[PDB]
Amino acid sequence: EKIRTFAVAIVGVGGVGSVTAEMLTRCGIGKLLLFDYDLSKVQAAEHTLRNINPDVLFEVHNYNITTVENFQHFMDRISNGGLEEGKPVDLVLSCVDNFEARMTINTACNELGQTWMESGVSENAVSGHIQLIIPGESACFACAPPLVVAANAASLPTTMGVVAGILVQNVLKFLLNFGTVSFYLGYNAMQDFFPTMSMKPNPQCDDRNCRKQQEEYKKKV
């Protein structure tokens, strides 16, 4: 019911992204915005998803957001593509499998002061994670590299399933304000370990907007 009043952007519509898109659609999220870069992949996903739950609204884009020109458009849609035009999306989800795209999303979110979550799964399928980022309040993707160790074909879609479900659950807890949102939640599939933590921002982060947001956040006193 209340869930129908939110919009979520999802970047990366393969692997963890398709499962996540499908779960959110099945929950009746008001709007999903889909970004990927090859009907194209996103318009294909939109078609399948709208069949699953026609209550959900979609907007899709197929451009490479790592060029500054497309990055402009990406930021425009984050800021204005909410359920009602001209309002921001409530959350951005990174379900991408490369560093450049991920860092690209981090740069947009730092610029906009947009809360987002990033997720990943290993090629080997033995591990994955989700993380919440609140620019200026918690570590962004540029503040520090990933340091949490993984204490050492069928498995791969399964691990994607677990990570996607945990992601969606945290999206629901964030949008609907119940339980506790995780800041970092890891998944070691071989051991059934779920390491968790949160990290403060790096005051010397390379991302000058992360730095800017931190100051703005501190200033609230």
Ligand X SMILES: Nc1ncnc2c1ncn2[C@@H]1O[C@H](COP(=O)(O)OP(=O)(O)NP(=O)(O)O)[C@@H](O)[C@H]1O
Which spans of this chain sit near a copy of itself (rule: CB under 8 A)? 1-3, 23, 26-28, 126, 153-155, 157-159, 161-162, 164-166, 168-170, 172-173, 176, 178-180, 182, 185, 189-192, 194, 196
Neighbouring residues of 194: CB distance < 8 A, sequence distance ≥ 6: 185, 186, 187, 188
Judged by CB under 5 A, the chain residues 103 through 142 that form the site for Zn ion are 140, 142
- Considering only residues 29, 150, 181, 210, which one is a binding residue for Zn ion as defined by CB under 5 A? 210
Nearer to a copy of itself, 153 or 221 (CB): 153
Instruction: Consult the annotation and say whether 192 binds a ligand.
Output: no
> How far is residue 179 from each of residues 32, 176, 187, measured CA to CA in Å?
23, 9, 20
Beta carbon nearer to a copy of itself, 67 or 158? 158
Q: Which of 71, 60, 53, 52 is nearest to 32 (CA)?
A: 60
Q: Which helix (H) or strand (E) holds 158?
A: helix 155-176
Q: How far is the CB of 220 from a copy of itself (least distance, A)?
A: 26
Whole-angstrom Cα distance, residue 76 to residue 116?
Answer: 16
- Residue among 29 and 42 whose Cβ is closer to ligand X: 42
Structure tokens at 85: 């035009």
Considering the complex, state which of residue 6 and residue 71 has its C-beta at the smaller distance from ligand X. 71
Nearer of residues 110 and 182 to Zn ion, judged by Cβ: 110
Select the residue interacting with ligand X from 7, 9, 10, 12 (CB under 6 A). Answer: 12
What is the layout of strands, in order, in the sheet containing 184-188? 57-61, 31-35, 7-11, 91-94, 116-121, 127-133, 184-188, 196-197
Sign of CA dihedral 141, 11, 107, 133: negative
Q: Does 28 belong to an annotated binding site?
A: no
In degrees, rounded to 5, the angle at the alpha carbon of residue 105 between the alpha carbons of residues 158 and 59 is: 80
With CB under 5 to 8 Å by kind, the binding choice for 210 among Zn ion, a copy of itself, ligand X, none is Zn ion
Residues annotated as binding site for ATP? Answer: 15, 36, 41, 64, 98
Residues annotated as binding site for Zn(2+)? Answer: 140, 143, 205, 210
List interacting residues with ligand X (CB under 6 A): 11-17, 35-38, 41, 64-66, 95-98, 101, 120-121
